[PDB]
Design a protein around this ligand. Structure first.
Ligand SMILES: Nc1ncnc2c1ncn2[C@@H]1O[C@H](COP(=O)(O)OP(=O)(O)OP(O)(O)=S)[C@@H](O)[C@H]1O
Ligand SMILES: Nc1ncnc2c1ncn2[C@@H]1O[C@H](COP(=O)(O)OP(=O)(O)O)[C@@H](O)[C@H]1O
Ligand SMILES: [Mg+2]
Ligand SMILES: [Mg+2]
Ligand SMILES: [Zn+2]
Lengths: 619, 657
DNA sequence: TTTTTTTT
């Protein structure tokens, strides 16, 4: 009480100390207000992340009280924050619901938890009733769900509104007499009441299970997990399989056998963590700073920057420069048009190489995987047609999402795709072509987005690609699938003593690499952009570039495609309209690399150059 | 202790404004009061459901404000707490309820018959809802005006299931999504009336909860007057009843975030609106979003956590008169509507106009015929497309599926034959085998698109044999011996064995299909891709323009819009022409000629399979469809020769080489 | 356990 108000004013002083908090609060208030203004048709939640170190410095006593006795300090702290916001807030012409909303302001903390930092397995009963943080992977995310907190009721025949608030262990840090959870039916006077929904306030309740990190998981031990009651904005801030660190008040619940009804009384009290803030842990989404964007812009000024970036890729691998450039364009993707009538125009690239064993094609796919923002790694035998696209699961019977469904806007890769079962290959056909997946098994008709880019790898029908024999002979895949697929890169080993020595020296220098910190015998643990900078450039481009066809580039593309299709010369695969689409997408990707909103004839020329390099052979 | 909270709302003032609006408001701008007119029909018992349009409320508010009033902003007000306002509107309707006009429908209504009797014996006594026979409703605000603007943050904007937030509870909202499942209608009582002989008094218990407990005793005075204790008896006739049905709406895959399972919301529908919905159909619904209370024990188990549901005020369908009539005579006067539509089909796609024409003919479908003897011949039309890969076949099928209002898309591998036709789920509940409508069932009175049909399993291919030739679906699986009408149209996409057609191989061999299957199709198109420098250039130019400009190059052609094609297609399908005798002689001679050709043309190079009566029936169906497009009352020899030309072109595409 | 469509 008196201590509560004293803590309230103390936290008021703390807020006064760091206007940055008040500045952020005002930004939230003004932002929401302007959003409400001129809504042609999101609102920042009332929550603040107060730096824990700031509290430790301003008043170590209050900081320690928060960390140890959150139930007695956090409540008054948030009270003070809400009061400061409201007084400082204009709250002009609030809606009747807004009047009854009483929407308060929440608190949160950042880093510097020390001992209070923990792990699900390292958690201990002692920490109960103490503010703490733990890290782990999310599992068994329970669904969102409303939760009564106030029951605004109108007293008919009296023209009045009688609300009732409700208490729950999750809702309040402090223990309070449980609310009966009964809607006020009749006024205490005797006038019948009416449940004025909307005016009555509700909150979003979520329950999730964060489990200890399997990497941390000790041998011969099932990783311990603890539950977190995500609420309000905190709800829907993650999903299953999310490595995350969370902050909450580790709290106890139930009777733990102490209740008289309990007979054995050999059980323990239930415990939970009322998460106050959640910090997702990708280790993803690359980040950019104005300085980096300017660097990217200046880099685009470089003419052959495309070549530089391509070389930067797979620097360990050697000899596949053209394939490196193809991978670059693929990562850039291109423009996926979608006609107003509804037609879908694939704008994604697919890359596949038939190569000899140990060609590093698998290693190349591994590089593309790790460098990729969001990728899917799989293999012919290791993959399944349903497992790749989707499998109807008994769960009501649901539909399991296959690889294609995963990373729908991301990329995908397959190793030993030739070894993939042909049934699952025809399963792929529709996914890749239509860029969507539809399933109507087990009486469950469904359709799914399936626009993920795909980059498979395979060995020729005979292990070693016999150039003498036809590619169709050397390729087990149906030409339909091949023509379906975009870019065929036949890679063949050759005994070129000069080249053999070149790669020998390359790999030798690679193995000779030295970590700058480490030395010889110390076990671990021309320009080329940095791989993180490379990914940053790629994301910046894709975010803020949409190349537009140029009639000159159109002329070049049409000429190339029509000639090639009419070129009687034997081809690695038959020429089809899909070849024309591939040309369009290649030019789009090249222009994207050029960071230009308008395509250029040079872009299409380069696309045609590479396409001839692949389809007809070295060019 | 139930502390009073001031709020900027006065239900008395709002009720007065509501009454003033109802009595006053008229659709004069559009044109007694229209609302008073509706209430007059209700007094006539002409209508048992009342829809109050929030846009009309907004118009009335605008009129009052322009006049100058202490406007209660009702239109906005209804959104925050809809249910109480619905009750207020119903009470106002009763207050302003006009007297019956013309002849009242209480010829045998027990309520009207006995309610007065009950009063004469007596000479709110009984709950107002008991007498009330009109189902109140609210039309959602039209987003076109969005006059709220700043106020119209997203009110009309339909929101995915996950888009819904507890804050919206107690508020009218709009949601777009597919109806996963729909329950069977069931009755529910707004008021329950018990009758006890001892009193002779008919008490009126009113129930608004999910469940209720019986009174089982008489508080009626007459039993109290004699001190007797009454044995109350339920009276279904006396007790008020309303129809109820339940529907579940699930998030659209597009709405669904990547890696997130779709969420579904349960929907409660009552009164006239019941059965308005249809399972598996995209729909935009607007209604009050309310919590669902529990049973006492389950309530204590759940506590402050509450179930939530939606009560639909109004329903809007993205797809299914005089205006239509004029719209269609516009195109009819334009002329050449057949070729114009064929070109309008797949504006993206270039060439293959004959294929588009055949697809249009399939869209209209042939006349379904039933004979006095009881014969019925499928009027639906089935076409197969057998061609080299990458020739836009899949794109064409998807375009058609989108075009047709009831179309459904499917792929052979992704769809199981059982699931394609119908599935018997062993354990929906209590491990009771239940038939599940397959993709074809979804395609009923619609078109089903099957890709990679060659890749489709042969056994499931035989399974679809039954449905495609014979509309009905007969199922004798364990515990389920049943038949389904399953009337639908079939379009199949496939490619020649080895991917692309082999001139060396016979047309049938490249087709690689059962002869029974082949014949069951009305048409098979052997579209093939050959390098043609000029044609390649033309197609490349068209595609390049499509990329450069999203609209396809006009090429001096005008394409009708999807809604327009669907409207005209419905109108044409309404025709059902009947053909003539000269056409009979022509078609008989043509069929005899074709059969003789086949009887001599068994050569592999030119062998396309023996002609069958199904071929003649398909020709007749195509001619009837052509008449439908031309809208003639009778099939013309022109239609017959056109269908023959279509078939001849389909076969000659290979012969042209 | 036994029976059972249905998918894997
Ligand atoms: N005449 C055409 N007009 C427009 N686009 C075309 C045309 N011919 C081919 N295409 C395009 O080339 C590709 C053809 O392959 P898809 O349409 O994906 O499938 P399809 O192979 O043509 O049909 P299938 O064999 O049933 S999967 C698509 O991207 C089409 O948009
Ligand atoms: N041109 C090359 N440059 C660099 N490394 C190569 C090259 N060719 C082969 N290798 C090496 O050979 C190893 C095995 O390659 P692998 O991915 O198994 O090829 P494949 O997928 O064809 O079997 C890889 O680790 C790779 O480093
Ligand atoms: Mg390898
Ligand atoms: Mg296709
Ligand atoms: Zn009685």
């Amino acid at each position: 009480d008196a201590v509560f108000g004293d803590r309230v004013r103390r936290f008021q002083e703390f807020l006064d100390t760091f206007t940055s908090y008040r500045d952020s609060v005002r930004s939230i208030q003004v932002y929401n207000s302007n959003n409400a203004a001129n809504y042609n048709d999101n609102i920042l939640p009332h929550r603040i992340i107060i730096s824990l170190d700031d509290l430790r410095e301003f008043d170590r006593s209050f900081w320690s009280g928060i960390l140890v006795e959150p139930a007695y300090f956090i409540p008054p702290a948030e009270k003070a924050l809400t009061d400061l916001a409201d007084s400082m807030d204009d709250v002009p012409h609030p809606n009747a619901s807004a009047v009854s909303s009483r929407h308060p302001w929440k608190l949160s903390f950042k880093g510097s938890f020390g001992a209070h930092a923990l792990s699900p397995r390292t958690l201990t009963a002692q920490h109960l009733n103490k503010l703490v943080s733990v890290e782990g992977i999310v599992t068994k995310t329970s669904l969102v769900r409303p939760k009564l907190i106030r029951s605004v009721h109108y007293a008919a025949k009296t023209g009045r509104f009688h609300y009732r608030d409700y208490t729950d262990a999750t809702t309040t840090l402090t223990t309070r007499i449980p609310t009966p959870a009964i809607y006020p039916t009749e006024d205490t006077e005797g006038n019948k009441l009416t449940t004025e929904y909307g005016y009555s306030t509700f909150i979003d309740h979520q329950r999730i299970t964060v489990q200890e990190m399997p990497e941390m998981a000790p041998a011969g031990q099932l990783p311990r997990s603890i539950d977190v009651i995500l609420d309000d904005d905190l709800v829907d801030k993650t999903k299953p399989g999310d490595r995350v660190n969370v902050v909450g008040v580790f709290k106890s619940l139930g009777a733990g056998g102490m209740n008289q009804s309990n007979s054995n009384t050999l059980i323990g009290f239930k415990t939970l963590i009322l998460g106050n803030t959640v910090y997702p842990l990708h280790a993803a989404r690359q980040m950019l700073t104005d300085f980096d964007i300017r660097n990217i812009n200046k880099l685009s000024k470089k003419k052959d920057i495309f070549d530089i970036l391509s070389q930067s890729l797979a620097p360990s691998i050697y000899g596949h420069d053209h394939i490196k450039k193809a991978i670059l364009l693929m990562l850039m993707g291109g423009v996926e048009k979608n006609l107003e009538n509804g037609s879908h125009l694939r704008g994604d690239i697919n890359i596949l190489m038939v190569g000899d064993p140990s060609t590093a094609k698998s290693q190349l796919l591994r590089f593309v995987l790790n460098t990729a923002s969001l990728a899917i790694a799989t293999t012919g035998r290791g993959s399944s047609g349903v497992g790749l696209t989707a499998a109807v699961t008994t769960d009501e019977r649901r539909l399991e999402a296959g690889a294609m469904v995963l990373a729908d806007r991301g990329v995908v890769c397959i190793d030993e795709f030739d070894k993939m079962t042909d049934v699952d290959r025809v399963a792929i056909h529709e996914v890749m072509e239509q860029q969507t997946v539809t399933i109507a098994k087990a009486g469950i008709h469904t359709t799914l987005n399936a626009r993920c880019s795909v980059i498979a790898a395979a060995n020729p029908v005979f292990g070693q690609y016999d150039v003498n024999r036809d590619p169709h002979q050397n390729i087990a895949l149906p030409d339909s699938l091949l023509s379906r697929f975009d870019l065929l890169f036949v890679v063949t080993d050759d005994i070129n003593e000069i080249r053999d020595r070149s790669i020998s020296e390359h790999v030798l220098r690679t193995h000779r690499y030295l970590p700058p910190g480490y030395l010889e015998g110390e076990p671990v643990r021309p320009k080329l952009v940095t791989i993180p900078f490379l990914r940053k450039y790629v994301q910046y481009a894709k975010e803020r570039v949409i190349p537009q066809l140029t009639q000159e580039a159109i002329n070049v593309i049409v000429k190339n495609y029509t000639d090639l299709r009419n070129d009687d010369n034997t081809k690695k695969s038959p020429i089809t309209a899909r070849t024309l689409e591939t040309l369009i997408r290649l030019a789009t990707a090249h222009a994207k690399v050029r960071l230009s909103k308008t395509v250029n004839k040079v872009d299409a020329k380069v696309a045609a150059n590479l396409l001839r390099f692949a389809l007809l052979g070295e060019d | 202790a139930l502390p009073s909270i001031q709020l900027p709302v006065d239900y008395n003032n709002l009720f007065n404004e509501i009454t003033d609006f109802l009595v006053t408001f008229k659709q004069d701008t559009l044109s007694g009061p229209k609302y008073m007119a509706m209430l007059q029909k209700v007094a006539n018992r002409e209508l048992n459901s009342v829809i109050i349009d929030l846009d009309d409320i907004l118009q009335y508010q605008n009129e009052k404000f322009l006049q100058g009033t202490q406007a209660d902003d009702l239109v906005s007000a209804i959104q925050q707490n809809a249910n109480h306002f619905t009750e207020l509107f119903c009470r106002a309707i009763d207050n302003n309820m006009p007297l019956p006009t013309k002849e009242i429908d209480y010829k045998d209504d027990v309520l009207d018959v006995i309610l007065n009797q009950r009063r004469l014996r007596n000479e709110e006594l009984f709950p107002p809802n008991l007498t009330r026979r009109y189902f109140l409703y609210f039309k959602p605000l039209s987003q076109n005006c969005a006059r709220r603007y700043r106020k119209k943050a997203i009110s009309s904007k339909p929101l995915s299931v996950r888009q819904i937030k507890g804050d919206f509870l107690g508020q009218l909202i709009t949601v777009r999504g597919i109806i996963t499942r729909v329950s069977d209608v069931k009755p529910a009582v707004e008021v329950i009336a018990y009758t006890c002989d001892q009193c002779g008094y008919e008490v009126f218990q009113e129930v608004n909860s999910r469940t209720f407990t019986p009174l089982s005793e008489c508080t009626s005075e007459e039993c109290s007057q004699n001190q007797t204790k009454g044995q109350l008896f339920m009276s279904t006739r006396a007790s008020k009843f309303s129809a109820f049905q339940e529907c579940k709406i699930q998030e659209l895959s597009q709405q669904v975030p990547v890696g997130h399972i779709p969420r579904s919301l349960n929907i409660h529908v009552n009164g006239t609106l019941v059965r308005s919905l249809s399972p598996g159909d995209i729909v935009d619904v607007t209604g009050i979003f309310l919590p669902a209370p529990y049973t006492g024990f389950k309530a204590l188990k759940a506590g402050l956590l509450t179930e939530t549901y939606l009560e639909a005020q109004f329903v809007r369908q993205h797809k299914k008169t005089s205006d239509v009539e004029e719209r269609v005579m516009e195109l009819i006067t334009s002329g050449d509507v057949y070729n114009r539509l064929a070109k309008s089909i797949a504006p993206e796609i270039y060439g293959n106009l004959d294929v588009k024409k055949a697809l249009l003919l399939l869209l209209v479908g042939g006349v379904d015929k039933r004979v006095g003897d009881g014969m019925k011949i499928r009027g639906d039309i089935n076409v197969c497309l057998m061609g080299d890969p990458g020739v836009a076949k899949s794109q064409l099928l998807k375009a058609i599926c989108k075009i047709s209002p009831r179309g459904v898309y499917t792929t052979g591998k992704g769809s199981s034959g059982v699931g394609l036709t119908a599935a018997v789920m062993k354990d929906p509940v209590t491990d009771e085998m239940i038939l599940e409508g397959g993709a074809l069932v979804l395609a009923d009175n619609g078109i089903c698109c099957i890709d990679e049909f060659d890749k489709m399993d042969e056994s499931d291919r035989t399974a679809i044999h039954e449905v495609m030739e014979q509309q009905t679906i007969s199922i004798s699986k364990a515990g389920i011996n049943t038949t389904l009408n399953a009337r639908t149209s079939i379009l199949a996409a496939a490619n020649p064995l080895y991917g692309r057609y082999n001139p060396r191989l016979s047309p049938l061999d490249n087709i690689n299909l059962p002869a029974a299957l082949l014949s069951r199709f009305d048409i098979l198109f052997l579209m093939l891709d050959i390098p043609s420098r000029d044609d390649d250039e033309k197609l490349a130019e068209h595609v390049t323009y499509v990329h450069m400009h999203n609209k396809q190059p006009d090429l001096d052609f005008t394409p009708v819009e999807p809604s327009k094609m669907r409207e005209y297609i419905a109108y044409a399908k309404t025709k059902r022409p009947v053909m003539s005798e000269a056409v009979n002689d022509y078609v008989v001679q043509a069929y005899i000629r074709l059969r003789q050709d086949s009887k001599r043309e068994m050569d592999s190079k030119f062998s396309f399979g023996q002609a069958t009566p199904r071929t003649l029936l398909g020709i007749i169906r195509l001619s009837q469809a052509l008449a439908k497009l031309r809208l003639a009352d009778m099939v013309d020899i022109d239609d017959v020769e056109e269908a023959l030309r279509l078939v001849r072109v389909s076969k000659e595409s290979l012969y042209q080489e």
